[PDB]
Amino acid sequence: MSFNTIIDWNSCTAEQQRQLLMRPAISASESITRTVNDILDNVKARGDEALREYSAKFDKTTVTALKVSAEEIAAASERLSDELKQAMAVAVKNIETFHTAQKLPPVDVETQPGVRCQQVTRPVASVGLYIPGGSAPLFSTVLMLATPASIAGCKKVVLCSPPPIADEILYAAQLCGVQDVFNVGGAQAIAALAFGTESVPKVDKIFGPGNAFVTEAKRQVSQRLDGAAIDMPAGPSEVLVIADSGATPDFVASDLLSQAEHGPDSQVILLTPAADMARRVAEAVERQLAELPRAETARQALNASRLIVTKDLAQCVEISNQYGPEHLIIQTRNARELVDSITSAGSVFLGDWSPESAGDYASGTNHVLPTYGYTATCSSLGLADFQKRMTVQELSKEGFSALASTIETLAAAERLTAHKNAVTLRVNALKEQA
Template identity: 55%
Template structure:
């Protein structure tokens, strides 16, 4: 049972500076020495033993005794046959919207003549190989398979490997397989946790080595991504991951039932989810508090939601402007703006992963089907990391082509800068060319 006492209402202006800081602080992340050591050992063993270790960890951590990591065609077909028409239609609709919004992000190369005879180009190229991590365990997450699989498909990454832990019966989720098929992912691997990320980073007999690993996960997955992105595997990762968050910015036009429903939809993700209401209206805060109690007690996942609400806040500010400032400072992963003129207000809000504008835009819309990506920066990283998009499946590099005349024109600048920086060979690479007889190349 959740009661009113479990959810405090905070008056922002009555807090000291350090209390304000504490109010917006994220729950501390456990990156303990023991976690680091466990993950380091898992990585080391996967690197040395490959599939043998991967199968062993899958038995140990996922309680699944499988003999074959990669799904073959027969397995895929058998799983696909289990997917209901209703599930297919839901995934198809989400796929279409996600695809449309990500296709619209297709980058274009840029070519410019910066000075006569000097042509510079910025080119985009799809990453050659990507690993897509789909969390498993109790839930099955076809939506995450779409969020990672669709942009990888549009970019045209040649090698796309999806990994996800099997259930205790040693099977992959049929809906995840259906989503993966839509995205044209050929290699589906039954493994999860730190061991799956390590397998993608180094490659094993069954799992192709990839250049970049995407996707959310638990503390082990996150730690493995962190370690592998700085070690000899040479992989890169999408972004640092933390528990999921929602901040609702509401004024007195907000419907407290909608606000409470949104806060709970975030709270049910996990006990470490953080949900925050910021509003200049004390009446809305009280009404949301009451609605949270009513609605929470009717939820199947009440235990998870209750724990999440314990570290959550209902903050009353003195003005809408102050509410905006608090929001910008918190930098939420998900930001719902439920105010009059929500679109106008949203233009002032820049530090968020994704913004849900207006009373009829629930966060769960973007989680699944509006078309935006649901892989977003958490834990305050919405200040300096981008939301996942098509561009994360490309890399940018440059070219320049200079004619003899173009080089002559740049020579004075290059050689002077080389002099200032004390780099004589840099200078000579220019002068040796200009001294050469034309055509002597």
């Protein structure tokens, strides 16, 4: 009943320790790349016609109106329970509070007298959100994406999801101010958003995860000048828990299983200085798994899980920093004190009462995070992903005069005489008047 068990880290060889922290590579798949390539070209060339043809071959009932009406949105909202609507409101309120707190303060400084430099921000003008479908869609991603778009001040916010779109997605969209929702999914939805169709607007940037085709479609459109930008590359999700002797096995196990149930390629890792904790967590994981309504997916993910025993907490921190987990959960007595030493992780959870579930749904932090090692250079999705920094400078006659010789010297040293001449012309015009 056990597919392996506990790994004593220091008993491993140097080679094994390095492979233990490596992530499963992606097979390219020339076939998916070509299918998506053809879907993208077809949607750009033939618009809604192309989308309806695709729909006709999948849906059984071919989509007609690509845009979801206000009436369909209101009927969907009426079918939802007050309990669910109230829970979404609490979530959106916390997400809004945290992301609003991310607004950049003004950057306005005179680097030297009369040389005023500023950094200002401007919203990405139009954004497209993609939400995977199905009977039980993860509608919470709508709150995670539409909320910061709204706070950033994006002028157009639209969303695509495979028809028929669940009531929960339609209500979440409405709740967050999403302007238009369209009955399209997969690589065709990514194409419709990146290129525009008669019904779907062309957006500047596309957000949201999806399957291999959606992921490949986002990859492709981000590489074409006639395409659109995307939020961040994709890959298998992950959770790494650091637990000491004072942790509760069932809490640890429940966090590993929350992540394992997401998909068969989820990576879940435990790092602990106590072999006893590792064994107890392994038993808890096995007992809790047995009770999951549909544990087939979690069971698969657990085959890549690693329950590692280390020498101490400092080594747990060294290993986690090398891995750079999407979610880092720290169930140790001194959890907060360890944060200063964490150098790579998407979102961190501290203590016994901060399950990953709390962040996935309502704490206020964003659950769209870098995975598959991308935490090395990418950030948690945040307000900054919906806007861009622009710089501004104004030199007075005095500021310019005081900096002119320095600029001339540098331009002369790079042998860029035109750059130098733009300065000389002004120095002469100023002497001429003074």
